[PDB]
Amino acid sequence: QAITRAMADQARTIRIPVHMVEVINKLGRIQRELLQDLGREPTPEELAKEMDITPEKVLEIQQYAREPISLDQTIGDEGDSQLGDFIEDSEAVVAVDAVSFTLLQDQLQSVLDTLSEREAGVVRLRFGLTDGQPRTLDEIGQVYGVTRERIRQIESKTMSKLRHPSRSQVLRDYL
Amino acid sequence: KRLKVVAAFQQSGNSPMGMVLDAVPVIPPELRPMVQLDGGRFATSDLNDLYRRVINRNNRLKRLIDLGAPEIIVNNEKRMLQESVDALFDNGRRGRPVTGPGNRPLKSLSDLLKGKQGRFRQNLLGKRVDYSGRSVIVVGPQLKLHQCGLPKLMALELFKPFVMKRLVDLNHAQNIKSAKRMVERQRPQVWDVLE
Amino acid sequence: VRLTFADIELDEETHEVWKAGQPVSLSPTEFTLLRYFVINAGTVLSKPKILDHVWRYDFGGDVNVVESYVSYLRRKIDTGEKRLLHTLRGVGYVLR
Amino acid sequence: MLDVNFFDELRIGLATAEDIRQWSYGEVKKPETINYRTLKPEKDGLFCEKIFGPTRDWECYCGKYKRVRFKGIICERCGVEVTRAKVRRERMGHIELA
Amino acid sequence: NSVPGAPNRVSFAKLREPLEVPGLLDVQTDSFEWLIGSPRWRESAAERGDVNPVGGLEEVLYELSPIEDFSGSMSLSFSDPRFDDVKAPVDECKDKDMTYAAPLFVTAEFINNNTGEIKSQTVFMGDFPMMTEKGTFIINGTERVVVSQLVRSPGVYFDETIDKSTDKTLHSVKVIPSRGAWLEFDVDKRDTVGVRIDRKRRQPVTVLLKALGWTSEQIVERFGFSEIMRSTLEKDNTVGTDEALLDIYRKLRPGEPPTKESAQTLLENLFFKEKRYDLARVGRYKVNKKLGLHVGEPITSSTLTEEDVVATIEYLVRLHEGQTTMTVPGGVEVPVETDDIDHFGNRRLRTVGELIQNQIRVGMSRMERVVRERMTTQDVEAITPQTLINIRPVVAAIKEFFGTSQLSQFMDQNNPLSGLTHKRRLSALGPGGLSRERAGLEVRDVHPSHYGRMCPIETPEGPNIGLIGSLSVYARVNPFGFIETPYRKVVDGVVSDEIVYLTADEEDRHVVAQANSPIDADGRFVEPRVLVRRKAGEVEYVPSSEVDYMDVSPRQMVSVATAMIPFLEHDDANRALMGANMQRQAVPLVRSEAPLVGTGMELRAAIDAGDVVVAEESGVIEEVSADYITVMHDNGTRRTYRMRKFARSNHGTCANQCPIVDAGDRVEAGQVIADGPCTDDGEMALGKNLLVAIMPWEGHNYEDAIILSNRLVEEDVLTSIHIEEHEIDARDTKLGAEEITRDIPNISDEVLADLDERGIVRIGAEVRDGDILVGKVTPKGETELTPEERLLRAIFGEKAREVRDTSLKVPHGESGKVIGIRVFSREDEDELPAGVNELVRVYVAQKRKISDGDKLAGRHGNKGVIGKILPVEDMPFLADGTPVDIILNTHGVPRRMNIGQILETHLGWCAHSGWKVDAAKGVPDWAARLPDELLEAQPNAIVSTPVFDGAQEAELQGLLSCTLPNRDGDVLVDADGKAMLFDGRSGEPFPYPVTVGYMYIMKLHHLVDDKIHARSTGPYSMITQQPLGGKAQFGGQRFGEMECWAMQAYGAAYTLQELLTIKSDDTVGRVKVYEAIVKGENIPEPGIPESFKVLLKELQSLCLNVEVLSS
Ligand SMILES: [Zn+2]
């Protein structure tokens, strides 16, 4: 009991609960028994019949059972470089979309300035451009001394005039 | 030969207590990344295995001493912990190295410093570098001495920010996104501005 | 341009939903929830997806609002024998 | 010590337990790396957000804060400091040997 | 010709060989037949060594059986390893990524002796991968070849050394068995004899002999002359068999208390028990032959024996005493001499069958362990062979070999030559052999025993020079893995027609004569003294009445690729090596014209490479199309050969096949029916015949560069088809399932025009860089929506677009047409990897024309890139007006000693123009020995020059003399092979005649399109922010330490700072520099590289208090 509990709790790089390790080992054992008996490998539906659970959960268990590989094992046919020399940095800054983002920021500033100051401020505080919070209609109402209904109408009017062909075409290429 | 270390300890402010360790540090996780490659398969940096081994041995030892056990059991656990720490820093310096799947040794901390393929030489003095290319060499007998003939496609790829900025200056594109598209499709309005 | 999944038939332009010829009137919130479910048939949508799209971003309340709305939609259009709007615990909801 | 390419000297010496604990931003005590189901780092594991920094930028362990405004304020539910995930490339911890 | 459909190829060979070239795939086919146990191999063993015909699988089964328990009252055994019909045909297996395999069954017998029980069961042992008729394995749709490797044969090896302290001559012996513990003996600097066993450096022979049940009296009685170790025995300082046993025990097994019986049982168990120590049958044979132990006895009891050990010691002491002959008691007299480790009589060849048998041995060792454990655990009288056997270790082991082992490699198929050279190749790496980190110069050298066994010219050129070679064209593998070569025998100084195959062991005991010796048509040589090879690899002259062997033919010492080099003997060794190494890199063109000058080897090479369809039964041809050929056999039945077209090989080259037959002609068995990629009329053709001038021209052919006419571009003389495949898979994921659909968010319409409703590009729709091949869209949901995205969908009306587009796009830098598509899905029963529900592969072809930067080569190692393609008008043209096709520089020939290419040029011009030797008054003197039917050749004839019985210089000069005019009466090429050219640029005739001719030029697989790279900004690595490397990723060049040194040497500091900081590691510097360069301001100051910070934290994690001090 101690050895098996410790194996379940410590053998894998990614910890797997014992309740799932038990089913993984049972699935593997009976699948190899079935292969030996039948002469061919058992299909997922056949294995699900013995698991008394659905083939979707059988496949989920199968893909759960996979283990990681080392980032430093030699990938080349000879020993020249490690697998870690072939993996990209997903989280790294692509360094060309940053320039696109800042220039689109400037263009959005200009387009907002094309509109009236009241509507521009309403949209800014409504979508969170000056700060991080896109405020609510009540907040813009209390900061502008105006009713929330009039705010809704001013937002709709602002959006209608913002739909205008030059603004739409100018912003469209930035995507 | 004994004084050349004893006097070194005496002269400075260091303390020979530094030889032994009560706590070991842990490298930041990004320096030992774990990432999912294409196909769902996972990849670890091979250092987390050594760290996991050390953690397991230490936790088991503390459980043993807090539960009460024969000194031979406790000493075996302590020896295992010491060997785990020695494997962490230097895998294979003492005895056979700890090996993973495929009967290959796990790379330890010092293993990423020593050697030509180690950090100091393969990664710090040398460096992979941007704005660079390569290709085969042909003779240019009609060139001048201060001159070299460069492929137009590779030159376009190399000078890409320069040419994109100049071509948006010439108004052939409205923005850098349009400029990047006409760079990728290599439209005829880029070749003349390339020169 | 008619949104469909087997039993459920949603039309945007006329703004009502059919169960194989059975229309029922729904609340606007639940209507947007059903529409942006049906356009993502067979795909898991997590709680932040749901809240950010159907509700506005500035929804500063607690999440069980979507729980109650999924209950509404289940007792309304799932009321058939088969269960379509299934739930993946700790992940989200899928109509399938 | 500010990373401004103005370095008058670079010194090396033996490290003591006090220096190790000073470097450490926490103690790691669980040999767990990543959750097998939600693919998120475990608490007190080898990748713990509380010890090493948040995995995603400007996000807590559960996502209670998801805005750039919360600068250097630790989550009361999780204990993670809201900052750039690149601190995980610099933040280091330690373990205590029995 | 001995081949029914052979085109006539007049030859300059003077001598007639006795025996024809063997089947060139015998090395693999015979080995696999031995492993399996086919009736063909049964007959072979019956006719040769019928004393014990046993296959590899039968042998491993009989060795493993019987498996016993501790009680011994019940046991298990294996018998009758039988196969079954293969799963699917080779084409099917290659199509659907299966493995060309077959079931295997074993008749397991479980016996119970306590009461008497026999249980017979046909247990399914697994699905054994099979070998195709062309000698390759098909694994997961890939053609893999298992190259035979070279390892020292296990056995006993003696060596001699000089101490250099007193110039004392020391002698040592090593008994190195496969799968055992070493045995060692030596004589020390003093008279003491050391027996350091299992790396335990003590124990003179006295203790071992005493522990072997021998006494000092027996030792002095048997071994009396050995005064050296007699003195050693007098200094035994240990008497008593028990004392010696305890000494050996306390040395080899420290930490355990010796016992009376553990010592004896351990000494026996270490060597004399086959469970822990066994030389293979080859090792036992080697020891027996070395020591003359058994000469008329069969091989059994493969483990070591005590009398073998004592014979080894006797041999060592006799050798150190200066003896030259010994007779072991009960054994035959044998010479006493040291052994060479690199002699091919000791370097055996592990072939495919042996490697497979060893892997099976490992798998079945695990089998035996598991079955013994289960047979102990499970209850008796309720146990079955099926319940006992668990084939998983065996199948896992065979898979683990056949994939991911450096002795199993992709069968490179740029051309049939490359395939046939990857097979019949001898490597020296992999498990069980030395590695590139271990190679010695003595290993890399050419041993004199190589002659006729392994080619000394054909070998890789890079760092692994000398560790990889090729079998000689006439070579064969002995039943024990030793390479043997045929040779004729001379009796009474007359050469018989009898051919015997001789191994390097018996060659030293003979004096083998030369292939091209002046035979007298009766058996005698014209000169008494002939040049031959003696015992020690020396070459000397010998009276003719004393030689005893002779070479079967010339080219016996050469490989299959090198034997296709004309005028080989006129080429330097290393240049010929380069030519042979480039013969196998030539791409297949669209025509593949047969060379004007060649050797007779091309026909057999094309036949045996398996890339040419052959009529397996003689008959008429009923109907022929571009895809199939039907033949009407004599005996009523008809056969259909399907012909593969435009199939991509492992290296992205076309494998088109074309019929060369009519609709009514009859064909014989073995005749070529349809030619392959690099073949013409059934003979290998790797290039094209080009009209060449060898003058330097305007510096465009400076330093090995090559110039060509533009008509080579226009007429598609040098052009190739390059087919590339792209894969993408739709796989399930946590959020749902990715789907391949033409509906892909935020995409234009013209780029969707080539996409059908399925979502995959239409067949035949041409494609270019950046386009979509497969529209595959993935379920992502939503992420942090930046304010600007919300503003955009508000302003214009952008929708949810909840999905992400990870569509298949063509990789950067290629285009072309789309051939075909294969689509796999689970809904169509197709077996797929778990988690993937749809797989798509897309095939793209480019008809690549010849261009500058591409690499051309002759057959003589004269390679070069294309400096400039020249307009057809601006080329040197003969007086007839025909422009030359290719120009090579003349400074490259005399420096490199490859005059054979010029000989080929002259003979090629002669063969292109035709000739007639005027036999008005007899034949001239040079043509006296020239063969008939060669005195007169029509224009555009084809000639064969065998590599060493080639065309003599006098014959070639005489041929050049009479070179009948082309169209009108004009001899453009004069007596000495030169001609007068007109400069196509200035028009004035060239002041001096230059040589012109026809040379065979081939295009190598080094096209500039596959070697051009540029990078401005791409991916970066994770641990350190350095850019990636290689064309697979976006690359980034390596600025190494040498480049850093050069930059410091210039004194240039700022560019070094920029090359290290803001181009590779400083992340903020990278982003800021990109912003500055796009906006138009000067580059900002660099920061601190990220790699240095990584190093700082790394050193900190090693308990080093390292910090930076600012003042
Ligand atoms: Zn939190």
UniProtKB/Swiss-Prot annotation, chain B:
Induction, per UniProt: 6-fold repressed by starvation.
- The source's superkingdom equals Bacteria
Q: Which family does it belong to?
A: Belongs to the RNA polymerase beta' chain family.
The function of this protein is: DNA-dependent RNA polymerase catalyzes the transcription of DNA into RNA using the four ribonucleoside triphosphates as substrates.
Assembly:
The RNAP catalytic core consists of 2 alpha, 1 beta, 1 beta' and 1 omega subunit. When a sigma factor is associated with the core the holoenzyme is formed, which can initiate transcription.
Q: What is this protein called?
A: DNA-directed RNA polymerase subunit beta'
Which organism is this protein's natural source? Mycobacterium tuberculosis (strain ATCC 25618 / H37Rv)
UniProt gene name: rpoC
Q: Which residues of the full protein are shown?
A: 294 to 488 of 1316
Curated annotation (Swiss-Prot), chain E:
Q: Which GO terms fall under molecular function for this chain's record? A: DNA binding; DNA-directed RNA polymerase activity; ribonucleoside binding
Q: Which CDD domains match?
A: RNA_pol_B_RPB2
EC no. given is 2.7.7.6
Xref: SUPFAM superfamilies = beta and beta-prime subunits of DNA dependent RNA-polymerase
According to the UniProt record, what happens if one changes S408T? Answer: In strain: vr3; rifampicin-resistant
Outcome following mutation: F410V:
In strain: RJ37; rifampicin-resistant
GO CC, one annotated term: DNA-directed RNA polymerase complex
Result of mutating D412V?
In strain: vr3; rifampicin-resistant
The GO biological-process annotations, alphabetized, read as: DNA-templated transcription; response to antibiotic
What does the UniProt record report as the effect of altering H422P in this chain?
In strain: vr8; rifampicin-resistant
Cited InterPro entries? DNA-dir_RNA_pol_bsu_ext_1_sf (IPR042107), DNA-dir_RNA_pol_bsu_external_1 (IPR019462), DNA-dir_RNA_pol_su2 (IPR015712), DNA-dir_RNAP_su2_dom (IPR007120), DNA-dir_RNAP_su2_hyb_sf (IPR037033), RNA_pol_bsu_bac (IPR010243), RNA_pol_bsu_CS (IPR007121), RNA_pol_bsu_protrusion (IPR007644)
Stated consequence of mutating H422N: In strain: vr6; rifampicin-resistant
Annotated phenotype, changing I118A:
Weakens interaction with TRCF and CarD
Q: What is the effect of changing K119A?
A: Does not affect association with TRCF, but weakens interaction with CarD
Name the reaction it catalyses. Answer: RNA(n) + a ribonucleoside 5'-triphosphate = RNA(n+1) + diphosphate
The free-text function statement in the UniProt record for this protein reads:
DNA-dependent RNA polymerase catalyzes the transcription of DNA into RNA using the four ribonucleoside triphosphates as substrates.
Subunit architecture: The RNAP catalytic core consists of 2 alpha, 1 beta, 1 beta' and 1 omega subunit. When a sigma factor is associated with the core the holoenzyme is formed, which can initiate transcription. Interacts with CarD, TRCF (Mfd) and RbpA.
Would you tell me the protein name for this molecule? Answer: DNA-directed RNA polymerase subunit beta
